[PDB]
C-alpha cells in the first residue's frame, strides 16, 4: 500500500450547482464532525478608494444577529449546540464557516444562509463596531509583520486596488454608513459568485437540498452592468522604508511579481520556495539545516526569523521573502537571500530540487488534515481555479518539476527583475534600491 | 468514503504498549510517548527535561547530528518533541513510503543518544531562547507559578528550565534521565498510517531496553497558596484554582462539564460570549475590557480546577470576586438541566473535534496508551459525558468552593486580592 496508491483512496470532492448560480461543494469522509461554510469572491481588491474598509465592517457585523434571529440569538443558537462559527476577509476572498457535528449539518447550513442573506446591520451596532475596528487598527500598528506586508502590498501594487489594505484607512472606518455597506453587500454577495463548501461526515446530496432549501432564497442572478469586472493591477518595482529606530528589530519583505492563481509555474515556484525554505531561532536544525540560507542565518545569527512566500491573486502575485533581524544584519541577510535566488536561477542542483518536491508533497498532504482545512480548500479552489484539484494531480505536477524546470521558472521571475521592497524599523543598514536591484543579476 | 479500520493494540511482555491505526493516508504519523515530563525531575536535575526536549537530533549512536537533520529533510519528514508536565512525546511525520527511515531516526534519538559534552554544552543557551520565546505569553508565567504554588514535589516543576539551572545541566544528567525514565514500563508506541506487524517487529527488536522504572514519580502532595509577580503590564493576569480530581475517574468528567457551564472559550468569532456563565457574570458591574475563563487541569496523579482572570489594572479586585460569587451560586445549586445539557454538548462536540485531525488523535491514543492501559473509542467517552449527573457537577462546584486554594498572579497587582480577601 504505497503513497502512489494512497492518492487513489482520496474521496473525489463532489460539486453541484443551482439554477440561481450558487455552487455546492463537498468532501465525504466517515468523520463524526464536519465543517461547512460559505466562500465568496469579495474584498479589498473589489473595494474602491471611498468604500475601502467595508468588507471588514460587514465581516464584523455579520455575527451580531440577523433579522430571523435578532440581537445575540444567532450567536447563542450556535454556541449552545456545541458547534463553532468563524469568518475571515482578505483582499480577494471572504469566508464564513462553521465546524459542527455531522447530525447538525441541516441546522448549520440554514444559519449561514441567514448570516449571508438576512443580515441586520443594526444602526446602534455600526457605532459599536466602528469603535472596535478603530482600535483593531491600533493593534496592527504594533504588529510589524502585518505593517511590512501591507506596506509591501502598498508599494508593490501602488495606485491600484490590490495596494489597498483589507482593514482600510482609519478615515473610512469612521465615515462608512449603512448605505455603503448594504450596497456593497447587495452588489457583491451574488449567488453565482459564491460557493457552499462542506467536508467530513456528510453525503453530497444532503447539502444540495439544504442549499435548495435555504440558499435558493438568496439573490440568484445579477443585473446587467452593475456586478463589476476586475482590472489587472500594475506591479511597480519600488521601495517603502519606514525608518523607526525605536523598534527592537527590523522587518523587511522583498518580492518580485508572482504569476497568479492561474499560472502552472506556481508548482515549480513552490518547489523552489521550499528549497530556500524558512527558519526561526527556535528551530532544532541550526547549522546542519538543509537550506544554505537557513544554516548561514543560523550559524551566524544573521536573523532571528525568515520565511519565503508566494502570495497569489487573480492575474498577479507576490513572490519573495520576509526577514526579521538585528539592526546590523540586514545587508548580509539580504545578500545571502538574493544569493540563493541567483544560485537557484543559474544552477539549481538536481537532488536539492527533489528535497523541495518532497517538502511540498508533505506540505500539501499534512495541510489537508481535518475538515476545517479541506472545507477551506474546496471553498477557495472553486473561487480561484474554478475546480478543486486532486492531490494525485498536484503530485503529477510536482513529479514533473526537475532542476532544469526549477531553473527556467526561477530565472523567469527573478533574474534581472525589479523587486518590491518593504522595510520597517531600524533599517538604516537596509541596502539601497540601486544596490538591491543589482542583486538580481549576474555577480559582482 | 473509505472503510474505517480497527485501531490495533498490543501490550508486549515488558508492559510496552503498541497501537496502530492503518487508515491508508498518504501521510504517516508515528509517536513514541514516554512518561518523562517535569514531574519526574528531582529537586536537583531541574530543566533536564526541557533541555532533553531541545536535545533531539544531537549526535546519536547510529546517526550523526548532521545525518539526522539532513536525512529527515531529504525526504521532507518532521521530528517533533511534545512535553507535558507528565509525558514526553517524540512524534515523527512523513510520506508513507519513508516510514522506516523516520522510524529508524526516531529510535536512535530515544534509545541511543550519546549526549557529547561539546554538543550538550553548545546547545545550553538555547534554553535561554526557547524559554524567553515561550514567556512572551503572560499565561506561561501565571501557569508555571500556579503549579509551583499549588503542588510541592512533582507537579510543582516548571516545563521550562529555571534561570539558575540554564547552562548547569550535565551530559551525565541526560544519560541518567534517559536511562532512568525511557523504559518499557513507561512507553507507548503509537502508529498512524502504518501496519501493526512492523510496529511490533521494530519495538521487539530495537526498543527492548531495560524496562524497569529507573526512578518513579512522587505522589503529588498538594500544598496550596499564592504567588504574585509584580511587573506592571497594561493588564493583570491572575489564575485561581483548587484541588480537583485525577483523570480516569468519573469525578473528572463532572469538572469537565462544570467547566463548559462556566466558561469554555470562543465558539463564535467576535462574540460577546453570550452563553458563557463566568464571562456573563463578570459582564455586569464592570464596564471594561476584561476577560475570564474556566481553567481545568487533570493529570493521572492529581488535578486543578478554577478560573483565569485577564482583567484591567484596578478591575482585578472586582473581576476575581464577581467571577467567584458566580461559581459559589453554582455550588449552592442554581443549575437548570438545559445548562448541563448544553455543556454536555459543548464537551461532547469539543472532544470529537479535538481528535479530528491526525495530530490530536495520535496524542489522544498515546495519552490513553500511557495514562490508562487501552484505547476507549469516542462513543464510550461521549457516553461517559452523559453518565455525569447534575449532582456530580454541583458537587464538583462544592468541592471547589470548599477545597484548598491556589492563586497565581502577575501584572500590576495593587488592586488584586489575596486568597484571604476572597
Amino acid at each position: 500500500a504505497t503513497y502512489a496508491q494512497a492518492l487513489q483512496s482520496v474521496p473525489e470532492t463532489q460539486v453541484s450547482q443551482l439554477d440561481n448560480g450558487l455552487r455546492v461543494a463537498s468532501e465525504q469522509s466517515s468523520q463524526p464532525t464536519c465543517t461547512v461554510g460559505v466562500w465568496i469572491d469579495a474584498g479589498s481588491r473589489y473595494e474602491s478608494e471611498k468604500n475601502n474598509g467595508a468588507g471588514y465592517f460587514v465581516e464584523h457585523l455579520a455575527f451580531k444577529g440577523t433579522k430571523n434571529r435578532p440581537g445575540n440569538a444567532l450567536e447563542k443558537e450556535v454556541e449552545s449546540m456545541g458547534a463553532h462559527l468563524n469568518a475571515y476577509s482578505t483582499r480577494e476572498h471572504t469566508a464564513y464557516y462553521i465546524k459542527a457535528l455531522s447530525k447538525d449539518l441541516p441546522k448549520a447550513v440554514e444559519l449561514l444562509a441567514d448570516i449571508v442573506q438576512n443580515c441586520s446591520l443594526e444602526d446602534s451596532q455600526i457605532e459599536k463596531e466602528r469603535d472596535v475596528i478603530l482600535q483593531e487598527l491600533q493593534e496592527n500598528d504594533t504588529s510589524m509583520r502585518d505593517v511590512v506586508f501591507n506596506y509591501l502590498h502598498a508599494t508593490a501594487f501602488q495606485g491600484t486596488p490590490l495596494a489597498q489594505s483589507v482593514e482600510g484607512p482609519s478615515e473610512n472606518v469612521r465615515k462608512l454608513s449603512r448605505a455603503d455597506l448594504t450596497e456593497y453587500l447587495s452588489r457583491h454577495y451574488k449567488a453565482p459568485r459564491m460557493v457552499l463548501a462542506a467536508a467530513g461526515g456528510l453525503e453530497h446530496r444532503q447539502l444540495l437540498d439544504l442549499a435548495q432549501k435555504h440558499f435558493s432564497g438568496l439573490s440568484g442572478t445579477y443585473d446587467e452592468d452593475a456586478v463589476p469586472t476586475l482590472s489587472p493591477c500594475r506591479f511597480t518595482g519600488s521601495q517603502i522604508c519606514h525608518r523607526e529606530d525605536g523598534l527592537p528589530l527590523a522587518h523587511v519583505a522583498i518580492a518580485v511579481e508572482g504569476p497568479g492563481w492561474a499560472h502552472p509555474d506556481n508548482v515549480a515556484l513552490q518547489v523552489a520556495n521550499a528549497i530556500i525554505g524558512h527558519y526561526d531561532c527556535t528551530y532544532g536544525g541550526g547549522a546542519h539545516l538543509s537550506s544554505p540560507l537557513a544554516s548561514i542565518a543560523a550559524t551566524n545569527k544573521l536573523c532571528q526569523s525568515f520565511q519565503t512566500f508566494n502570495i497569489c491573486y487573480a492575474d498577479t502575485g507576490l513572490l519573495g521573502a520576509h526577514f526579521v533581524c538585528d539592526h546590523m544584519s540586514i545587508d548580509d541577510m539580504m545578500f545571502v537571500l538574493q544569493g540563493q535566488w541567483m544560485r537557484l536561477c543559474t544552477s539549481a542542483t538536481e537532488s536539492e530540487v527533489l528535497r523541495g518536491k518532497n517538502l511540498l508533497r508533505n506540505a500539501l498532504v499534512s495541510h489537508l488534515d481535518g475538515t476545517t482545512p479541506v472545507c477551506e480548500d474546496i471553498g477557495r479552489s472553486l473561487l480561484t481555479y474554478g475546480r478543486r484539484i486532486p492531490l494525485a494531480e498536484w503530485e503529477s505536477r510536482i513529479a514533473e518539476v526537475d532542476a532544469r524546470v526549477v531553473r527556467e521558472v526561477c530565472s523567469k521571475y527573478f533574474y534581472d527583475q525589479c523587486p518590491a521592497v518593504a522595510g520597517f524599523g531600524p533599517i538604516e543598514q537596509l541596502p539601497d534600491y540601486n544596490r538591491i536591484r543589482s542583486g538580481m543579476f549576474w555577480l559582482r | 468514503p473509505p472503510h474505517p479500520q480497527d485501531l490495533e493494540f498490543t501490550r508486549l511482555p515488558n508492559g510496552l504498549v503498541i497501537a496502530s491505526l492503518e487508515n491508508y493516508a498518504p501521510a504517516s504519523r508515528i509517536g513514541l510517548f514516554i512518561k518523562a515530563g517535569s514531574r519526574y525531575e528531582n529537586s536537583n536535575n531541574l530543566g533536564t527535561s526541557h533541555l532533553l526536549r531541545l536535545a533531539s537530533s544531537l549526535t546519536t549512536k547510529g546517526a550523526s547530528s548532521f545525518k539526522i537533520t539532513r536525512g529527515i529533510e531529504a525526504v521532507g519528514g518532521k521530528l517533533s518533541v511534545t512535553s507535558t508536565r507528565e509525558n514526553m512525546a517524540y512524534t515523527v511525520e512523513c510520506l508513507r513510503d519513508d516510514v522506516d527511515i523516520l522510524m529508524e531516526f526516531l529510535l536512535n534519538v530515544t534509545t541511543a543518544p550519546e549526549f557529547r559534552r561539546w554538543e550538550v554544552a553548545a546547545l545550553q543557551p538555547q534554553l535561554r531562547i526557547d524559554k524567553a520565546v515561550a514567556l512572551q505569553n503572560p499565561q506561561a508565567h501565571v501557569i508555571e507559578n500556579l503549579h509551583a504554588a499549588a503542588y510541592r514535589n512533582a507537579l510543582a516543576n516548571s516545563l521550562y528550565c529555571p534561570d539558575y539551572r540554564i547552562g548547569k545541566v550535565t551530559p551525565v544528567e541526560l544519560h541518567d534521565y534517559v536511562q532512568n525514565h525511557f523504559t518499557s514500563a513507561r512507553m507507548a508506541l503509537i502508529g498512524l498510517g502504518v501496519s501493526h506487524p512492523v510496529l511490533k517487529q521494530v519495538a521487539e527488536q530495537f526498543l527492548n531496553i531495560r524496562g524497569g522504572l529507573g526512578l518513579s514519580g512522587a505522589k503529588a502532595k498538594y500544598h496550596g497558596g499564592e504567588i504574585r509577580e509584580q511587573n506592571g503590564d497594561s493588564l493583570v493576569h491572575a489564575a485561581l484554582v483548587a484541588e480537583s480530581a485525577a483523570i480516569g475517574s468519573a469525578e473528572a468528567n463532572a469538572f469537565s462539564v462544570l467547566q463548559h457551564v462556566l466558561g469554555a472559550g470562543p465558539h463564535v468569532k467576535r462574540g460577546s460570549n453570550a452563553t458563557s456563565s463566568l464571562y456573563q457574570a463578570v459582564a455586569k458591574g464592570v464596564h471594561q475590557p476584561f476577560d475570564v475563563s474556566a481553567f481545568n487541569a487533570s493529570y493521572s496523579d492529581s488535578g486543578l480546577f478554577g478560573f483565569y482572570t485577564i482583567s484591567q489594572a484596578a478591575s482585578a479586585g472586582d473581576v476575581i470576586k464577581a467571577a467567584y460569587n458566580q461559581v459559589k451560586t453554582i455550588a449552592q445549586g442554581n443549575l437548570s438541566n438545559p445548562d448541563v445539557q448544553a455543556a454536555k454538548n459543548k464537551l461532547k462536540a469539543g472532544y470529537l473535534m479535538s481528535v479530528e485531525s491526525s495530530e490530536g488523535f495520535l496524542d489522544e491514543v498515546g495519552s490513553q496508551a500511557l495514562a490508562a492501559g487501552s484505547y476507549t473509542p469516542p462513543s464510550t467517552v461521549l457516553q461517559q459525558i452523559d453518565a455525569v449527573a447534575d449532582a456530580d457537577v454541583i458537587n464538583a462546584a462544592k468541592k471547589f468552593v470548599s477545597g484548598r486554594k491556589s492563586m497565581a498572579a502577575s501584572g500590576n497587582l495593587g488592586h488584586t486580592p489575596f486568597i484571604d480577601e476572597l
Binding site: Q135, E136, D280, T282, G285 | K78, L79, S83, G265
Partner: peptide, 27 residues
Amino acid sequence: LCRESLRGQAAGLVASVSLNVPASVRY
C-alpha cells in the same frame, strides 16, 4: 505585541518544542 481581543481567551499548559514547527505553548 498588540493587546485587545480577549473573550475566554487564555488556553486551558502544554509546552511543545520541536525541530521544524516553531515552539508552541499550547493551553
